Amino acid sequence: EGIVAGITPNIDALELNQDISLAAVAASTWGGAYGAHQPVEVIHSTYQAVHQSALEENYYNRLWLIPTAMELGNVVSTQIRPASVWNAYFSPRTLTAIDREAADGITLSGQAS
Amino acid sequence: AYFTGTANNPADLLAKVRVHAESLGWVTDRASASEWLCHNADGYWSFNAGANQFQMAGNTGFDNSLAWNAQPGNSVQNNPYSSKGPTVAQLSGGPFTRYHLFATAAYLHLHVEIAAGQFRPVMIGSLNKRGVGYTGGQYVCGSFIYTPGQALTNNWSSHPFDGYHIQYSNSSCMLRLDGLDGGPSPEWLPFDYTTNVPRRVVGPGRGNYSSQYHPDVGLIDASANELNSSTTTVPCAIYAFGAQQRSRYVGEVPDFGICNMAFLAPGDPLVVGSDTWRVYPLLQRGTATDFDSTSAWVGYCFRVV
Amino acid sequence: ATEFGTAVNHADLVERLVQFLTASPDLVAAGQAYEKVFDNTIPASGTAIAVRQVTLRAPGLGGTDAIYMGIQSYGDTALDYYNLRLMGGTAFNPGAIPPGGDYWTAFANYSPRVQLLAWNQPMPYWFFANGRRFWIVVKVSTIYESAGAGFILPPCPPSQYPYPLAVVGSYRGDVATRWSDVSDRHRGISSPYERSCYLRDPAGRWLGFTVDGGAANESDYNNRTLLPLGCGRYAGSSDTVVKQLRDSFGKFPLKALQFVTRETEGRRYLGDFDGAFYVPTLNSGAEDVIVEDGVDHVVFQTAWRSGNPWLYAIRKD
Amino acid sequence: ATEFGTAVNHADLVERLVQFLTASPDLVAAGQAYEKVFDNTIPASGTAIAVRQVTLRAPGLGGTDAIYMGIQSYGDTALDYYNLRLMGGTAFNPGAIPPGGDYWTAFANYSPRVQLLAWNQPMPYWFFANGRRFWIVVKVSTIYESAGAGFILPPCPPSQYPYPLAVVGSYRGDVATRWSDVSDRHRGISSPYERSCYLRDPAGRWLGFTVDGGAANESDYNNRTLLPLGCGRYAGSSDTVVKQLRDSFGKFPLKALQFVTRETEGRRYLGDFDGAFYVPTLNSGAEDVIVEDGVDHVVFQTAWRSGNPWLYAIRKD
């Protein structure tokens, strides 16, 4: 009937600030498509296979990294900048840790470990 | 993966790209200073280097005693065109400012800056099957210029994956779709739209030309967002026409996308997520409506790894 | 997340809709159920059916969003239409309703209403819902109707655009129409026409989208369309690839629906339909179940006709 | 005389039709079965389905009449229409087929063909037949299609007008069409349009009837129409009583369909449809059965729409 379309390399590697889009469904196969009823519609059902996808699954189901390069330039006073991460997973993505290298003097206030 | 260099003549580019392919494990059935017969696990191909241009042609079998354009199942004789001409990529003679090469096990992508503001792309590989069961998918594309000085992007011009062109001799790019409408397996479909041939293919090649035939032209136009200055890539969907003008979607170009360069300079990086992308102009930087002397603001997007 | 079956009448259909939204095992287990903030029957029915008004709140998948939606059941027995009107908004306040009149004006940044056409009779129905959007498809039994609303998926941070609310219906809700209408304006979600689909701009101004132009419609919405079915803007011929799309070797491609605007001030790409796609008609049609990566999608056709460019599929998960 | 079922494909549909005409218990017991005078497949199918040609003879209820009919199954896989063409005549002559060409021209007093639209996939069907006329109706998903031919019932003795042969179809048979057509010319029996219903005049002239005029159609046929649905000729308003017809306290009134010609030369009453009537759409629709005086009637709607003018019922006996 229908098993898999693919599109695993493209979307995962596509120009996405997210990734692993529609990946949990791959393992969660299930399937009961076979079977037709008669609400006096018409007896038509042909092939019923897999093909293509949205093709625009962009920006789905993981963190974000808005900042990529910070132009601090000349620092002479206490500066404050925003850092945000957006997780679209249906389950949280816990950060393992923040290994601070040469980052002494940089602190986050109002946030946990 | 990603390579850069300079070449005073095309032959230097030939040598460098062949060296990279061999180092990456690509199998070359026969090699020469100017003629190539190479292949991989996907398909067979042949290339020839002219004085100021490339000649590319698809292949299905090998025969060392046959010319570069006479291999078994060659495109020249297995195409609807009455001219029976192979793929052609027109270049210039003398210095090439710089060439950018993307190398993988399934496809090769090249972008050569022949001069300041002049770019000539060379595209070869196989389309992502995307779970679609079909034999073929190999595509070879080249860059053609109509006439220097006059409008460079005239209607008669042809471009990779072009969806609209006027020419009776040569084709910029082509595609393989075996066993179409019950025909013989060797079939090398060209990207043409005005020939009314029963079997043909079309692509977003030209980008956002006025008479471009592809439903995503609007997506390419709107790739850039004014509100947040964000740019999104658009996979290049390819369509193939059947014997009775019935289209069948075939696939997309792997690791490739198009966008608008209105708010991006050549080579400007926009790292969207864990994977980085490189954007370069097709032919030259111009204005929005300069569809005659330059390539407007159409930009080719490659995934760098 | 799916409720297939047959409703004895429009009132029972709405009752089943609310029961599914409030007690679906998936919704309750995941805590994604919607909250009914208002429910009243203000009008004194004369030669017409009782009118039911309900306003419901959806928290979204994360529980941090604020989605307000409304559903109305307006009908007239003497004309034998029992329309179901849909609208969306961002805030609700019963005290702001002016004397008499109607409550839908109380919605902050209120939007024009859309509706679905049905009547009092047994009717097969196809229901889809999720924490961010809901879809309604009513099979008129030799005609197919459809509508829905929710959040599109934009490519920009929700931190800056947290309310990408979209509402779509088969026909504009400003007038009363009989489901046996013979006007081209009666169509589906894939091809809005004449005030059939609205999306909320990040600036807070609702913009209408139409796949085809119309003199009656405002000039502003002409520049903004749905590109997949609006390929005629750039193509120089009436016949194009989209109208001639077909399955490949027994496999049906699925094409998403795009929200795009081309304005003189600037361009912007808004997002895609979540769970709706365009599919060909050949060798297939309504009530067809197409699988993909273990995911099934149902096929439906517009009320106008059942041809290639007026047919779409909806994901059932 | 009546058969309800599902045919796996168009070829099987025609197969079941011929077996119903042959071995139906009522037909065989009463000796009203038709005779097959021709059956051939002349063309060499290329990118198209096999073409079946059938010619049959009907003796009538009294056994003294001479009725000749033909059925063709023309289809094209690459376009995916499996049209079923119909036509009538008074005599057949197999040797009158030219080398190449076709055989329908061999019919004495040949008439333009009408047709039926379907395609190769299981299809529910409704077959009605009698010694003097037959009716075919197929439920094509959202679309109900129908056609038929036979003898009308004039008010004059059959001694002087023994050949009141009538042929009616949903669309003209001179062109090939896909059953997903979006033209107003594709409609039902009750309302013909653009060469959809032909009647043999007592002067052996096949006169077509159209409820509504058309520039493309010949000027002669404009003045001859079907009065019940052609009330606009005399009414001075677009909205008339017939459009607003409705049942009376649960009783659906059945109105006979009419043949009338009002030309400059003169006027005349031709006959009525045998077993077909006009009924409303309200609180009802297709696949509905109503019993009058112990006789049941089925309800069907035209392909164009299910509007009040666009609906008729067929007696089932």
mmCIF file with all atom_site columns, C-alpha atoms in Angstrom, chain A residues 39-46 48, chain D residues 6 121-124 139-141 287:
data_model
loop_
_atom_site.group_PDB
_atom_site.id
_atom_site.type_symbol
_atom_site.label_atom_id
_atom_site.label_alt_id
_atom_site.label_comp_id
_atom_site.label_asym_id
_atom_site.label_entity_id
_atom_site.label_seq_id
_atom_site.pdbx_PDB_ins_code
_atom_site.Cartn_x
_atom_site.Cartn_y
_atom_site.Cartn_z
_atom_site.occupancy
_atom_site.B_iso_or_equiv
_atom_site.pdbx_formal_charge
_atom_site.auth_seq_id
_atom_site.auth_comp_id
_atom_site.auth_asym_id
_atom_site.auth_atom_id
_atom_site.pdbx_PDB_model_num
ATOM 1  C CA . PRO A 1 39  ? -21.887 5.942  2.088   1.00 0.00 ? 39  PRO A CA 1
ATOM 2  C CA . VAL A 1 40  ? -23.425 5.840  -1.414  1.00 0.00 ? 40  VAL A CA 1
ATOM 3  C CA . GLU A 1 41  ? -20.444 7.845  -2.714  1.00 0.00 ? 41  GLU A CA 1
ATOM 4  C CA . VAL A 1 42  ? -18.843 5.751  -5.477  1.00 0.00 ? 42  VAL A CA 1
ATOM 5  C CA . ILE A 1 43  ? -16.694 2.611  -5.427  1.00 0.00 ? 43  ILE A CA 1
ATOM 6  C CA . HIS A 1 44  ? -13.364 4.233  -6.332  1.00 0.00 ? 44  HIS A CA 1
ATOM 7  C CA . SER A 1 45  ? -9.949  3.693  -4.760  1.00 0.00 ? 45  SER A CA 1
ATOM 8  C CA . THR A 1 46  ? -6.816  3.186  -6.870  1.00 0.00 ? 46  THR A CA 1
ATOM 9  C CA . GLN A 1 48  ? -3.127  4.470  -2.687  1.00 0.00 ? 48  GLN A CA 1
ATOM 10 C CA . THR D 2 6   ? -22.180 -1.890 -8.943  1.00 0.00 ? 6   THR D CA 1
ATOM 11 C CA . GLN D 2 121 ? -13.409 1.670  -11.977 1.00 0.00 ? 121 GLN D CA 1
ATOM 12 C CA . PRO D 2 122 ? -16.213 0.027  -9.949  1.00 0.00 ? 122 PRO D CA 1
ATOM 13 C CA . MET D 2 123 ? -19.336 2.128  -10.381 1.00 0.00 ? 123 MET D CA 1
ATOM 14 C CA . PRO D 2 124 ? -22.833 1.926  -8.849  1.00 0.00 ? 124 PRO D CA 1
ATOM 15 C CA . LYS D 2 139 ? -23.737 7.850  -9.708  1.00 0.00 ? 139 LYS D CA 1
ATOM 16 C CA . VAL D 2 140 ? -20.323 9.286  -10.615 1.00 0.00 ? 140 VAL D CA 1
ATOM 17 C CA . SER D 2 141 ? -19.103 10.375 -7.179  1.00 0.00 ? 141 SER D CA 1
ATOM 18 C CA . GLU D 2 287 ? -31.241 8.129  -3.906  1.00 0.00 ? 287 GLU D CA 1
#
